[PDB]
Amino acid sequence: ESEISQEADDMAMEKGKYVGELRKALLSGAGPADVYTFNFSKESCYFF
Amino acid sequence: MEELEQGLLMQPWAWLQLAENSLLAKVFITKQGYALLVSDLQQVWHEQVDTSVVSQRAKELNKRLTAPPAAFLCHLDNLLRPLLKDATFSCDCVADALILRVRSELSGLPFYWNFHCMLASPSLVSQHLIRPLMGMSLALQCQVRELATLLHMKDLEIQDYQESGATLIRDRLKTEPFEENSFLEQFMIEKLPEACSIGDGKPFVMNLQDLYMAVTTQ
Amino acid sequence: MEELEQGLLMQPWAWLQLAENSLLAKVFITKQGYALLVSDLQQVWHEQVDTSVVSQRAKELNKRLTAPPAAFLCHLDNLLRPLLKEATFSCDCVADALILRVRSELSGLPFYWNFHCMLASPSLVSQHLIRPLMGMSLALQCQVRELATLLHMKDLEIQDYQESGATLIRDRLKTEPFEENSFLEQFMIEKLDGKPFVMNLQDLYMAVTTQ
């Protein structure tokens, strides 16, 4: 409940443009022209 | 010191993309930062803060500075286009405190940032924000008068050509020589109401700005 | 709101004859207080306050001499009458402790007077006055364009003056075809303190400052 509340109240998205960003950043929806440095820190166990 | 005004007055008079107002505001890209300078001779609202004071206000007074000043310097440096390619600057003119919320947005999620119009620096403004009057006078109000005199000697050449032959024939070109006093009087009495051209500053971006840079070059 | 400043702006600027600086000051003291608008191009004295400062100046030096405010305003109106055809103020080259000195020899014993001055506000030179100056600049640009068009059409009529003309020509004044590059070069390269500003624009400023 706290996570949903903070997701709703922090980023403050009401009819925004984050769906495309989610599709490109998370699912690698962008074309194979721009490399995305989604490096997961294996030693730190931290995904930023 | 002796570099911000020299590296800032050279900014072409370009209208900032405000949604409602049509104020005259110019700022030039400077490697040392930026300082919005406005000159109208009655009351200053210019953003200029010492590095130290903003340093303490960021270390122990502002907790929202989640982006290093290097990012701001990089964004300032990598901005070659003055005019927007198509980041709209919106203002809410509802009270005296004109809070021009500069929404820092590069591409995608708009980063949260805002400005504040505090007091400007006394020495620099008092020393370099009175020059534009004399710079306009000495240069422009002499060049224009010399253009008028050149027209006067052209009229003299026309009239003593006429008095030495080459008498004008057709009525289409039959025009009297120009007089400055008569032109001023007819402007005041007949075409002054219809010559009032302010609007949104049409010549401000096509003729006023370049000639003003020519004026403010010295 | 607008009445006082609108009335005062119509009043012509009075340059003080001190021969050491430029003073752009407005004076109109008839009613509704006194408009002693003293400005040295860097700090305008918004001396539109009520009789408080006048009374304190008149009483802190004169413990046995009193004059009515009507006499004060009449004297203020009569102050600058024989100057618009002396009431001269002299500054100094000393540090921020600006103390004006009046050493005129009138009775043998020097007369003492203090000129109260507050801190100069750095937020006093960016709001209004250039907007009418931008209007005057626009009028000047319109005049320049009109004169250039007149020059162009007169040049075209001169083009008619070689086939029906051929008058006495010194041969050192032939009219070449008009070229914009040469025109701009001659307008730019060749024909490109404060005192010249005021003694060149005092007459011209009243022309368009109204409308």
Swiss-Prot record, chain A:
| Protein location | Nucleus; Chromosome
Top-level taxon of origin? Eukaryota
Consequence when changing residue 14 to R = Does not affect interaction with NHEJ1/XLF
Q: In which tissues is it expressed?
A: Widely expressed.
Instruction: Specify the effect of residue 42 to E.
Output: Abolished ability to bridge DNA
Q: What happens when you mutate residue 21 to R?
A: Does not affect interaction with NHEJ1/XLF
Task: Summarize the PTM comment.
Answer: Phosphorylations by PRKDC at the C-terminus of XRCC4 and NHEJ1/XLF are highly redundant and regulate ability of the XRCC4-NHEJ1/XLF subcomplex to bridge DNA. Phosphorylation by PRKDC does not prevent interaction with NHEJ1/XLF but disrupts ability to bridge DNA and promotes detachment from DNA.
Q: Which residues are annotated with the PTM Phosphoserine?
A: 5
Effect the entry attributes to changing residue 17 to E: Strongly decreased interaction with NHEJ1/XLF. Abolished interaction with NHEJ1/XLF. Abolished ability to bridge DNA. Abolished interaction with NHEJ1/XLF
Similarity-based family: Belongs to the XRCC4-XLF family. XRCC4 subfamily.
The condition associated with this protein in its record is: Short stature, microcephaly, and endocrine dysfunction: A disease characterized by short stature and microcephaly apparent at birth, progressive postnatal growth failure, and endocrine dysfunction. In affected adults endocrine features include hypergonadotropic hypogonadism, multinodular goiter, and diabetes mellitus. Variable features observed in some patients are progressive ataxia, and lymphopenia or borderline leukopenia.
User: Under which name does UniProt file this protein?
Assistant: DNA repair protein XRCC4
Interval of the full protein contained in this chain:
49 to 96 of 336
From Swiss-Prot, chain C:
Effect noted on mutating residue 64 to G: Does not affect ability to participate in V(D)J recombination
One GO cellular component this record assigns the protein to is: nonhomologous end joining complex
Tell me the impact of changing residue 126 to D: In XLF-Asp mutant; phospho-mimetic mutant; abolished ability to bridge DNA
Q: What is the effect of changing residue 110 to D?
A: Does not affect ability to participate in V(D)J recombination
Tell me what PTMs the record reports for this protein.
Phosphorylated by PRKDC at the C-terminus in response to DNA damage. Phosphorylations by PRKDC at the C-terminus of XRCC4 and NHEJ1/XLF are highly redundant and regulate ability of the XRCC4-NHEJ1/XLF subcomplex to bridge DNA. Phosphorylation does not prevent interaction with XRCC4 but disrupts ability to bridge DNA and promotes detachment from DNA.
Q: Which GO terms describe its molecular function?
A: DNA end binding; DNA polymerase binding
Variant or mutagenesis effect after changing residue 13 to A: Does not affect ability to participate in V(D)J recombination
Q: What does the UniProt record report as the effect of altering residue 64 to E in this chain?
A: Abolished ability to repair double-strand breaks (DSBs). Abolished interaction with XRCC4. Abolished ability to participate in V(D)J recombination
Could you say what the effect of mutating residue 172 to A is?
A: Impaired ability to repair double-strand breaks (DSBs). Does not affect interaction with XRCC4. Does not affect ability to participate in V(D)J recombination
| Impact reported for residue 173 to A | Impaired ability to repair double-strand breaks (DSBs). Does not affect interaction with XRCC4
> Translocase as a keyword?
no
Phosphoserine is found on 126
**UniProt-reported outcome of changing residue 109 to D:** Impaired ability to repair double-strand breaks (DSBs). Abolished ability to bridge DNA. Abolished ability to participate in V(D)J recombination. Abolished interaction with XRCC4
Q: What is its main location?
A: nucleus
**Effect ascribed to mutating residue 65 to D:** Abolished ability to repair double-strand breaks (DSBs). Abolished ability to participate in V(D)J recombination. Decreased interaction with XRCC4
Q: What is the effect of changing residue 113 to A?
A: Abolished ability to participate in V(D)J recombination
The ranges of region (Globular head) come to 1-129
Swapping residue 112 to A/D leads to an effect described as: Does not affect ability to participate in V(D)J recombination
Comment, domains = The coiled-coil region mediates homodimerization.
Q: Which family does it belong to?
A: Belongs to the XRCC4-XLF family. XLF subfamily.
Biological function: DNA repair protein involved in DNA non-homologous end joining (NHEJ); it is required for double-strand break (DSB) repair and V(D)J recombination and is also involved in telomere maintenance. Plays a key role in NHEJ by promoting the ligation of various mismatched and non-cohesive ends. Together with PAXX, collaborates with DNA polymerase lambda (POLL) to promote joining of non-cohesive DNA ends. May act in concert with XRCC5-XRCC6 (Ku) to stimulate XRCC4-mediated joining of blunt ends and several types of mismatched ends that are non-complementary or partially complementary.
Its recorded name reads Non-homologous end-joining factor 1
| Organism per entry | Homo sapiens (Human)
| Gene name of the record | NHEJ1
| Residue numbers of the full-length protein present here | 1 to 224 of 299
